[PDB]
Structure formats: C-alpha cells, structure tokens
Design a protein around this ligand. Structure first.
Ligand SMILES: CNc1ncc2cc3cnccc3c([N+](=O)[O-])c2n1
Ligand SMILES: [K+]
Length: 336
C-alpha cells in the first residue's frame, strides 16, 4: 500500500522531493526530502500508514506538537520542531526539522559499543530537562526509548582502538532531541492500558494505572543501555520480564503484587517463576544485580548508577521525579 508512494524522486505536495529513507516501522516510514520552496533545505517527512490506529495517533501528535511549539518557539527544551502537515494520496504526512541518527542506530552501526561517560552525562541531562518540560505541562511521553532520542547531528570521528582491537566511532557533538509524540497523554486524557516491552515500567506490566513516573523508569533503562551498549531487558514475555527485574533489582513490592489485575503471573503473592527451569536459568545467568553491571569503581560511575537505581524504583509513588534528578550530583560536572 505504501511502498509505492515513497520512492527516491517522488515529489509530495508539489514541494518536497524524496531523497532516501530514514527509518521504517509499523506506523509508516520517515523520509528525507528536499524542500524546493525553501532553497533546497533538507527536511524529514513522516508518512503515516493508512490505519485507524496510526491515523488517529498522527492526529494526536499534531495537536501535542502545536502546544509544545507554541509554548516553546525556540526549542529550548529540545522537542523536535514540526513545520507543516498535509494529506498525500490519502496518507497523513508530518514535516519535521532534519536531525541525525537516533541514539539506537548510532550504537547499532558502532558494533553495539557504549557511549563515553561524559557523553552519557550530557545526554542524560538534556533528556531529563526535555521530558521534565512535558511533565510541567501535564504531559507524559509513555514511549521513551533510544529510537526516539535523536542526535541533532550524528557526525563522528573514527580511529583504531588497540585496547578493544577495533575501529571505534566517536561523536563530535552529542546534543539530542526527543521525537514521536503519538502516544503522549495529558493528565486528564484517557489512559489506555498498554503503553515498548523493553522499556515498560513495572506498574504498567501489572496494570495499576500510570502517570509521569512511568517516563522516569524508561529513562533509567535508556541510561543503562547507553552505559552497556545493549538492552538490559531483552525479551517479549511479560513473566520473563518481571523475572529479569527481580534478578537485577530485587523482589517486587508486596502491595503492588496484591493490587494487579494480572493474577496469571503470580501464585500466593509471589512471582510464579521456577528458578531451575529452562528459561529461568538463562535469566539467572544473563542477569545480575544492578550494581554488578558497573564497568569501573570510580566515583562518577557510582553516581550514575545511584541515579539509575533511583530511576528504577518499583513503586511509582516512591520513584524519583525529573525535577529532583536534574539536581543529582551526576550532573555537577556540567554546571558552574
Ligand atoms: C518516529 N517518529 C519520528 N518523529 C519525528 C522524526 C523526525 C526526524 C527528523 N530527522 C531525522 C529523523 C527523524 C525521525 N526518524 O526518522 O525517526 C522522526 N521520527
Ligand atoms: K484500553
């Protein structure tokens, strides 16, 4: 249905000329276009698949990005700037400013190697300052993942690292922005029950309701994947997910197990997971206590993992906020 209207050379709205593809998905694809009514400025256009789930999501996003671009005309809090929208061959299309590689794609194209700690520090601050901007405006992103954190420009320098014995890319400028607002939800809007699995919060898996706290859990999973270079919860089964958590973070709070509508996962108020099963032995040996993931014992590594630990607090009512986190000493090195 879609592969026929997003080819190199097509011209949309008699304006934008498609160059190449930036990313595919179930919602549709994002393509880099030459704007011919603006001297040749390259842009990005998202072509939403003609599905009611994704057509409505695009409509929910255009609204949010109108509020967030009015309130912040300069992108001080680093949300992506939407420029225009229009129909094309029956498909909704949204025009954004052209950014660089997503933080996920950079790690992938770099052989799944981690970021430097000072780069992690700057990136974590901009993410927090950005998502905390949404939390101040009664909003929740719900879909925070490395594929939605994009580099303003992903240009790097390459060299041979005789420690790891490999070519290693190194970012020149690591400023980021946050994209995809089709799942965002105001505090009063209807909160749907299911909101990606690897970055889903424990209160969501257990179906207890959610708000801004769930976004902080997602940022904790993003930060630990910047530090390690791979997903810490790499699974699709919900019971395996919770099992991995209990090995990395410890047993779930009892008052949360008692309130879940998902009685299937548990038995007698404890996770019905056999340690000595088939998969139970992969979880026991792939996962480990969170503190044991630290690559060094220098104080700056200690401080990051203290931030990540407070971000991965089970109880959302006890979990850190983003206002508190912006003051945490891991960000001391950036201030005067
Ligand atoms: C998934 N949602 C979404 N929203 C806005 C986007 C803006 C972009 C701007 N410059 C490059 C890629 C951009 C992508 N992208 O390819 O991922 C976007 N993706
Ligand atoms: K629902």
């Amino acid at each position: 249905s879609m592969h026929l209207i997003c080819q190199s050379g097509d011209v949309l709205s008699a304006r934008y000329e498609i160059v190449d593809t930036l990313g595919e998905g179930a919602f549709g694809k994002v393509v880099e276009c030459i704007d011919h009514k603006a001297g040749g400025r390259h842009v990005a256009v998202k072509i939403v698949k003609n599905v009611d789930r994704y057509c409505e999501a695009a409509r929910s996003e255009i609204q949010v990005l109108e509020h967030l671009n009015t309130t912040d005309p300069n992108s001080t809090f680093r949300c992506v700037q939407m420029l225009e929208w229009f129909e094309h061959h029956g498909h909704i299309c949204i025009v954004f400013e052209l950014l660089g590689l997503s933080t996920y794609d950079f790690i992938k194209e770099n052989g799944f190697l981690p970021f430097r700690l000072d780069h992690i520090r700057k990136m974590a601050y901009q993410i927090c300052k950005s998502v905390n901007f949404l939390h101040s405006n009664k909003l929740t992103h719900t879909d925070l993942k490395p594929e939605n954190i994009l580099f303003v420009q992903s240009d790097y320098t390459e060299a041979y690292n005789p420690k790891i014995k490999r070519d290693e890319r190194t970012l020149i400028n690591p400023d980021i922005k946050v994209v995809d607002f089709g799942s965002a939800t105001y505090d009063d809007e209807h909160h749907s029950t299911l909101v990606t699995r690897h970055y889903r919060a424990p209160e969501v898996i257990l179906a207890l309701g959610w708000s801004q706290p769930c976004d902080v859990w997602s940022i904790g999973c993003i930060l630990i994947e910047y530090y390690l270079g791979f997903t810490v919860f790499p699974t699709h089964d919900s019971k395996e997910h919770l099992a991995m958590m209990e090995r990395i973070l410890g047993p779930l709070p009892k008052h949360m197990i008692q309130k879940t509508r998902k009685r299937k996962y548990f038995h007698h108020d404890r996770l019905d997971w056999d340690e000595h099963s088939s998969a139970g032995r992969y979880v026991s040996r792939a996962c480990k206590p969170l503190k044991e993931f630290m690559l060094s014992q220098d104080v700056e590594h200690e401080r990051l993992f203290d931030l990540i630990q407070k971000m991965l607090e089970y109880d959302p009512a006890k979990r850190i906020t983003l206002r508190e986190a912006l003051k945490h000493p891991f960000f001391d090195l950036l201030k005067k």
